[PDB]
Design a protein that fits this description.
By secondary structure, this protein is mostly helical. It has one domain: Histone Acetyltransferase, Chain A (Up-down Bundle), CATH 1.20.920. It is built from 5 helices and no strands. This is Bromodomain-containing protein 1.
Amino acid sequence: SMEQVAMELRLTELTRLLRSVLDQLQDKDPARIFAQPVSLKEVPDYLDHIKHPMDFATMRKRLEAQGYKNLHEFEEDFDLIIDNCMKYNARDTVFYRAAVRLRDQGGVVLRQARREVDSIG
């Protein structure tokens, strides 16, 4: 149907805007601490601690499959990256600190992304 196409075009444009958002958030992680999944070879107990692992490569796979239907779903995954790290790692660690800085800096990006998603529809 023509309606299905129009919906598909909206999803494609959302995916475009989320790719730009993703790039901007990932630049706020210059140490690349959140770039890839925590390795279960190197952290064998991880899944005893963290039930829903997340990382920027995993988000990019979902994005490129157009697997984010709305900004809320994308923000959920970003919050998992931060929140998982802040639980697994202690306050005095470079990991925890990196997550705090990513959260604080990402907030600014996400605030305007929400406006753009609402604005463009």
